[PDB]
Automatic annotation (TrEMBL), chains A, B:
Ca(2+) 2 binds at D113. GO terms for cellular component: cytosol. This is Dihydrofolate reductase. GO terms for biological process: dihydrofolate metabolic process; folic acid metabolic process; one-carbon metabolic process; tetrahydrofolate biosynthetic process. InterPro entries: DHFR (IPR012259), DHFR-like_dom_sf (IPR024072), DHFR_CS (IPR017925), DHFR_dom (IPR001796). Its EC number is 1.5.1.3. One of its GO terms (molecular function) is metal ion binding. Pathway: Cofactor biosynthesis; tetrahydrofolate biosynthesis; 5,6,7,8-tetrahydrofolate from 7,8-dihydrofolate: step 1/1. The gene is dfrA. The keyword NADP applies. It holds the Pfam family DHFR_1. Key enzyme in folate metabolism. Catalyzes an essential reaction for de novo glycine and purine synthesis, and for DNA precursor synthesis. It catalyses: (6S)-5,6,7,8-tetrahydrofolate + NADP(+) = 7,8-dihydrofolate + NADPH + H(+).
Amino acid sequence: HHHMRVSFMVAMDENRVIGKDNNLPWRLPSELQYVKKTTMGHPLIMGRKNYEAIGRPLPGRRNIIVTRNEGYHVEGCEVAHSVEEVFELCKNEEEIFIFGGAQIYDLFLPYVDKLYITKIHHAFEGDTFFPEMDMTNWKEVFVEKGLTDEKNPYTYYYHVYEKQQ
Amino acid sequence: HHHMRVSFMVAMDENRVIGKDNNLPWRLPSELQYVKKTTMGHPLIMGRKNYEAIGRPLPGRRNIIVTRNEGYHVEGCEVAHSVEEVFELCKNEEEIFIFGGAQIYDLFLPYVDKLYITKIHHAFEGDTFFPEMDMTNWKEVFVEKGLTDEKNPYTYYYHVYEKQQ
Ligand SMILES: NC(=O)C1=CN([C@@H]2O[C@H](COP(=O)(O)OP(=O)(O)OC[C@H]3O[C@@H](n4cnc5c(N)ncnc54)[C@H](OP(=O)(O)O)[C@@H]3O)[C@@H](O)[C@H]2O)C=CC1
Ligand SMILES: NC(=O)C1=CN([C@@H]2O[C@H](COP(=O)(O)OP(=O)(O)OC[C@H]3O[C@@H](n4cnc5c(N)ncnc54)[C@H](OP(=O)(O)O)[C@@H]3O)[C@@H](O)[C@H]2O)C=CC1
Ligand SMILES: COc1cc([C@@H](C#Cc2c(C)nc(N)nc2N)OC)cc(OC)c1OC
Ligand SMILES: COc1cc([C@@H](C#Cc2c(C)nc(N)nc2N)OC)cc(OC)c1OC
């Protein structure tokens, strides 16, 4: 029924960890730079918790915050309360990026068409996870090694998967 | 329609600069060494401007110059005036290397199967750029750090991408 491409944007470790104590467990500026380039000009869909850890709208993109709170407001951001409201808000969009965290990934999981996933080759201590996915009907359409250096201290790969349908 | 592998050979910086004042903006002998090793025994396809900055044929390879000039001639070099003429000239070749500059990269962009790209981690002053590429259905199949030393004063990586089709 929806016509925008629903894409996931996530970074995770070898045990699917995405978060620790409501924060990112790793510092990877180069990964962030890849994320900004890929998502620029497209809506970001993020969970209330995810957003408040940032505290500020990300420029050049519609920032849409998903919460059950019907009186929740933040300047420079739009607020949705469900999958369907997000779909209404993004009716005419080309592609939207589901941007985390876990609760919001779970929420949008039945509708994902494309998966932009960074895989970090390290086992972090974590408390928040990227949900399991059945990859049957999914094709890897892009893979490349991320930049490892003194500013980016882990090995990691950018992966993109597309659903076949 | 064509049977030869069409490969790009290019070095660019972090903003896609490949040229300044009809020349290379950097001196990297080690990068040249990798280029000669990789392209040896295979045709080089070069734009007229690119070639004249060199002024002489590169040994051990067919040098093919692309120009609109129907009376253009250079000793020890072959001359093509279109994509199709290059294809005709290279119909039996296993792999040809599109060797620059930008106008010629643009020209052969719809037909590229393999991308040999050096990425230089520096922002040069430039006037000539490597075209944007949609890398969907491309996979990185090789990546290695280039030699940084007193003779090669920048950080750079060799990348190879292959089209999946
Ligand atoms: N590595 C990565 O790619 C990323 C990692 N992260 C990490 O993830 C963690 C945050 O994830 P998580 O704790 O899951 O929190 P979320 O970001 O998923 O936010 C959860 C909130 O979303 C709202 N929500 C959840 N379900 C619904 C629903 N069905 N309808 C309406 N609103 C809903 C609720 O808001 P409310 O309570 O206000 O009602 C809930 O509290 C952090 O550690 C963060 O650093 C986040 C993004 C990316
Ligand atoms: N960093 C790198 O990997 C490389 C960088 N370079 C740099 O790039 C710059 C040169 O690039 P650029 O200025 O784009 O010049 P090009 O090498 O792309 O040559 C342009 C010329 O090619 C011919 N040409 C262009 N389009 C066509 C066409 N459709 N049909 C037939 N002939 C055509 C024309 O020749 P004519 O006028 O005779 O008709 C045109 O003037 C230089 O600075 C060089 O150093 C070059 C190679 C590699
Ligand atoms: C850049 O802006 C940020 C974004 C996020 C977000 C995310 C993400 C995110 C990342 C990092 N990588 C990928 N591949 N996908 C994602 N969805 O939550 C962790 C947190 C940040 O710091 C608290 C950010 O810095 C202000
Ligand atoms: C070696 O022979 C040369 C070739 C080029 C060519 C190129 C290239 C080129 C380079 C350097 N690196 C990569 N990764 N791809 C390319 N396509 O145009 C700039 C210029 C030269 O000096 C004027 C060369 O020395 C005689």
